[PDB]
Amino acid sequence: GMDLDDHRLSNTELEQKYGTNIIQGLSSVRATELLARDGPNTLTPPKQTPEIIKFLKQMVGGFSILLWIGAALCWIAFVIQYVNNSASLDNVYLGAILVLVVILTGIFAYYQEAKSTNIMASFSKMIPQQALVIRDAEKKVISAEQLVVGDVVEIKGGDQIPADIRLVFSQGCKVDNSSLTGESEPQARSTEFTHENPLETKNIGFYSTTCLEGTATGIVINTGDRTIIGRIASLASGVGSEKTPIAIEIEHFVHIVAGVAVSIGIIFFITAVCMKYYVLDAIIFLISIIVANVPEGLLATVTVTLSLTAKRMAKKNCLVKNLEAVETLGSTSIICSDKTGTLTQNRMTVAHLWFDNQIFVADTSENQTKQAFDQSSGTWASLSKIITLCNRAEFRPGQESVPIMKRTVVGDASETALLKFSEVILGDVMGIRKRNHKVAEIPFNSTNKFQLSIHETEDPNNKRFLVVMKGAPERILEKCSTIMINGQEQPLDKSSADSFHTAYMELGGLGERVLGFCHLYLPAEQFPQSYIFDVDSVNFPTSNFCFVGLLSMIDPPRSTVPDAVSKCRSAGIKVIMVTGDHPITAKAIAKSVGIISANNETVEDIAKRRNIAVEQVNKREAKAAVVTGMELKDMTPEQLDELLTNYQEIVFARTSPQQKLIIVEGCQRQDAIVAVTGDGVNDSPALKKADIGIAMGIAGSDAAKNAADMVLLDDNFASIVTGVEEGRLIFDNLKKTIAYTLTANIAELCPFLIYIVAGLPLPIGTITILFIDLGTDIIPSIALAYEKAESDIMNRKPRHKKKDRLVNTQLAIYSYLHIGLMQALGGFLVYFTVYAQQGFWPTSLINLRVAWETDDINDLEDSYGQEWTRYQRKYLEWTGSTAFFVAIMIQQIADLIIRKTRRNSIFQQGLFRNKVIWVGIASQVIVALILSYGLGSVPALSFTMLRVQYWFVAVPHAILIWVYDEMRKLFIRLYPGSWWDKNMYY
Amino acid sequence: TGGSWFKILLFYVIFYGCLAGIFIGTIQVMLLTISELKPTYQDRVAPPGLTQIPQIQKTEISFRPNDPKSYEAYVLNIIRFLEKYKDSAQKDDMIFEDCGSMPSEPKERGEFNHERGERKVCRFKLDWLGNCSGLNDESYGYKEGKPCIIIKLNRVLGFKPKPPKNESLETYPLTMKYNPNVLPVQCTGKRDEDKDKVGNIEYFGMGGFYGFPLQYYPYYGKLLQPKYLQPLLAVQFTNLTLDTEIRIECKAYGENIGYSEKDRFQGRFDVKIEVKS
Ligand SMILES: CCCCCCCC/C=C/CCCCCCCC(=O)OC[C@H](COP(=O)(O)OCC[N+](C)(C)C)OC(=O)CCCCCCC/C=C/CCCCCCCC
Ligand SMILES: CCCCCCCC/C=C\CCCCCCCC(=O)OC[C@H](COP(=O)(O)OCC[N+](C)(C)C)OC(=O)CCCCCCC/C=C\CCCCCCCC
Ligand SMILES: CC(C)CCC[C@@H](C)[C@H]1CC[C@H]2[C@@H]3CC=C4C[C@@H](O)CC[C@]4(C)[C@H]3CC[C@]12C
Ligand SMILES: CC(C)CCC[C@@H](C)[C@H]1CC[C@H]2[C@@H]3CC=C4C[C@@H](O)CC[C@]4(C)[C@H]3CC[C@]12C
Ligand SMILES: *[C@@H]1O[C@H](CO)[C@@H](O)[C@H](O)[C@H]1NC(C)=O
Ligand code: ALF
Ligand SMILES: [K+]
Ligand SMILES: [K+]
Ligand SMILES: [Mg+2]
């Protein structure tokens, strides 16, 4: 409802506005009235449509409307026949089969469709139950849902904030805002208006976040869905009712096929009416047109191939929640990627350490066990003992089995990072810490800005007190007067200070937090081994230390992220970085993972290098762009569009959860399919808005996993690369399968048009072609989904979502007007062969069907003068139909062989390399054998047993199909861009 | 562009012309196999069907003798069929021959070849169809309660019917058989109810024999034997119950003759006759 915050207001005006008091809180008689007026502090669940309605919507999706019309026409034809006593139950069987086809395709489509899951349950780990509010000047432990605006609530370290509160009294309060920024770094809270942005003003406590430590008092300012997390969840749930690109392509293909069917139906219905035909023949012919023109089994096979690829991917730790998401990778133009936890290990580790005036680099992998950076020299043993001695962090016991880098440790980020580094390089560091009995004085403070500790060395011959003090590099330098170089305590001069400052600047220029380390050997003469120390700093020196080194921590990228980003960019995909972290760290991570290339520069970098101002330099030289949330919030959509178009390497830093969604929407309006990778609650609206959203398994939140279309169960971007490859392969194989099915559609359609025009006896029945659709052509179409790539999948650019369709005009015309007609010709050759060998020459069959189908005539005369009864005529008609069916099967075997490739040849692709195609060929042959010599041994469903020679009459036509396709692809290969690749390639 | 349109029309005209040429070439190569004298196979026609002349709609003959319009269609169909059996039509001696008036052996006229050209055909006289030739009674028996149907065996090229042997008494004896060279035909009510209302059926065949004489077989197939006349057997139901619909089944008998439950006209009739008062 309201989207503004009130943090510029002090206690008095807030009390006047919200009508409350800090001390007395609110009276219950007013608290309950306000609660009734506004509502409980609860998140409203979305409106989930019933599953039955979704299941029923699939019965009118795709080609189901045409099949329902066909079933209705079958019922009407059956009743017309029943009135006139000439009924054979064949239309009832056709209608029942069509209804069954609709039911099965609807079931498969329901399974394919993305499941709508609510996101409220993913916020249950947040959203506390009990709140410490004060009413009528006494504190009461009332539930969170009973809060209302104006109430005064206290928070304690370790609990969840009961609502969006504005702090009034705070005592060293720290909060974790990982749900708003994706960064778990503890944020200091106070009562001071610090920043213009409400999300970063340090005196606002947010609903569903956790208070790490301290104690704070505040006034509730937002309740329920009016809170930050409330709008985050509202965006995550409400938005996202869009179709996947493969769904759009399938819908376009269905539109093309339905248009063809309807146009031919109207035209040939007019031709039938004009040729003096009554109603029954016209409606039966329209039924035949519908049954021939609709691919009855194609969509279910599409779903089966999608599920096969989904389970193959799931075998590699890549969980596909939504089946259609297996294709969205591939045809993806832009990847908008979160940084922390997604491109980054979300672990704070040491990267660089500077000592002996030299900068050494340490390995930052999550599996590294030992690292070498010239440790044999001096000045490093002292540094390592400073790391161990001046470190408070402790492992949790019982973690011997788990490796070092995965061990859970108590402490802050820097303390744990130093502990992990020491435990890695030095080995067992608990024993060394145990040896030197540390004095109870270990002063650390948010204001002192240094960590101090005094230890006594356990060397048997030395037994000398050694003090260690670490902290911020400037506070470190001002508290020292010498430096350690090769073990010599050389005094720190002006040049040494300048070199230290240069190293500090270089380390800070990589987005690394830097710590200083120094020590001093307290003399035994003034500090014997019988001296007691006081925490009041009244008996030990806090100055004149010996500087040693400078370590820095980075929160580094994952091991397999840089090369995966490189492969994704080499596949033509733009990789955009959208993170809630600070700009410096974001830019450093982008350069480390290759999102911003080393050669490329940003406007600020160029201006600094040229010693000029940012305004002076034009912006065409800089190929990179780092954009903060403040800069983007003022940008109009036009400026955002120009920013996306002009720059190829873009980094958006310090972005709110709504700003990620805005960036995604800006990318999508560029006619692009965009993928979002995330692992946090703040990424959920962007994940749900994206065409495909990818979450991380180990590092991901429940909300991110629920909002995503895909989950990386092992946190590897190589899964993203393999998903792109698999999606592009799926697109190619879908093209092949669709062409293979359309060919059979036309091969089925042509006999009925010839039957209406020339007047021949029915070349093939309508029931027979249903066995083509749901019989011999089910397993070959699945087998075509197992084809390997004909070229480099990754070298190709992403396809344009508008200019590159799954089914284009070339595919449809080549399947309809080239290969389907050839199959019809072969079938008609076999049909005329069957009829002529029994007595009817081809010209005697023209305009014969009216007398042929007349039950009155039982002495119809053939070409030799013999007389035929009606049953013998219909048996010969069934035999011709069965021969036509077998011919279509043989030419579909040839079609299966030629559709194996779109440019290559079977000599190059390999005829026997894909064994699933040979399984499918065996399926075609076996199904035809069962339907001819099984069902057909008894005459049923217009099937009969054929003579052996009728199985091979159409073989040369199949060879001709193969030769024609081989020649087409050979000449496509020889002369690219020669009117032939443009007019004959699909 | 215009050049692209010209090329894409020329490709399609050439492609479709090539496809049509290949199709017609395959059809001609196939047709080279078959002959104009005899069919390659007789898997369907070999057991001949039995059909009647009036060519009725729903296996029903229904007429009122008072109204000539009721039986006019039946009579006209019989006239149309028998127009070629007139003595005027079979006058020539070059094409027709005066075959013996008593039943004889099947008359082989050589094997199926273009040699000897047009074969000769035996002539069939309407006089053998007494009460049903139409020579004396132009309306056959429809004016009275005497419906007349004419039975004919379906022409099958090179088919020689072999009459049933004396292994068993196939039905109630005809007592005038000449079984070596006569193919018997018997009409009886399908049910016991019809057998009590069918009446006295009088057959009319060549030589006074109740069936098809064998000197008309084999048939040589509309090329060697045009104007061939198949033998006929007139059947008349003199006394049948009025206003009742009687079911009649007529069968042919022989070793070579076969019957099918699926095909109701393979060697059998199922005709329904009613005569309204
Ligand atoms: C997309 C759909 C594709 C499929 C289209 C199906 C088209 C359906 C049309 C059917 C009409 C008949 C077609 C076949 C014609 C065969 C010609 C023929 O021979 O018939 C047989 C008769 C008599 O034979 P016989 O006794 O001498 O043989 C005895 C054997 N022996 C010679 C050895 C002694 O001969 C004669 O009556 C010859 C005198 C009559 C000639 C009529 C010519 C009509 C031909 C039409 C063909 C059209 C092809 C269209 C292709 C389109 C491609 C896109
Ligand atoms: C006896 C009966 C026998 C019947 C046999 C079958 C006859 C029909 C067989 C094949 C025809 C299939 C036609 C499919 C056409 C799909 C049209 C289409 O939208 O496809 C998509 C792609 C790209 O489209 P886009 O992004 O540029 O469109 C954007 C325009 N927006 C935004 C308004 C959508 O199309 C492309 O690949 C670029 C090419 C687009 C060409 C426009 C469509 C006209 C092409 C063919 C129509 C005539 C075919 C020949 C008829 C033969 C009669 C015998
Ligand atoms: C000889 C006859 C059969 C040729 C008929 C050609 C017809 C069937 C083809 C040619 C062009 C095709 C159209 C091309 C473009 C569109 C727009 C799309 O949004 C829906 C499909 C639709 C509407 C197609 C329907 C089918 C179509 C009209
Ligand atoms: C049966 C014969 C005569 C039909 C003749 C008309 C045919 C050849 C013409 C008419 C319309 C034409 C199509 C119109 C649109 C396109 C889309 C384009 O991207 C490639 C060419 C293509 C695919 C044309 C191919 C040739 C075409 C199909
Ligand atoms: C039928 O033939 C018989 C015997 O020749 C004859 O007596 C009878 O008159 C004929 N029927 C009629 C009414 O023509
Ligand atoms: F994990 Al983030 F922005 F880097 F939500
Ligand atoms: K179909
Ligand atoms: K999504
Ligand atoms: Mg994250």
Residue numbers in the entry:
A (entry chain A): 51 to 1036
B (entry chain B): 28 to 304
From the paper:
Here we study primary-active transport via P-type ATPases using functional and structural analyses to demonstrate that four simultaneous residue substitutions transform the non-gastric H+/K+ pump, a strict H+-dependent electroneutral P-type ATPase, into a bona fide Na+-dependent electrogenic Na+/K+ pump. P-type 2C ATPases are obligatory heterodimers formed by a catalytic α subunit and a auxiliary β subunit. While the sodium pump is electrogenic, generating an electric current as it extrudes three Na+ and imports two K+ per ATP hydrolyzed (black ions), the gHKA and ngHKA export H+ and import K+ in an electroneutral fashion (cyan ions). The exquisite ion selectivity and stoichiometry characteristics of these pumps are determined by their ion-binding sites, formed between transmembrane helixes TM4-TM8 of the catalytic subunit.
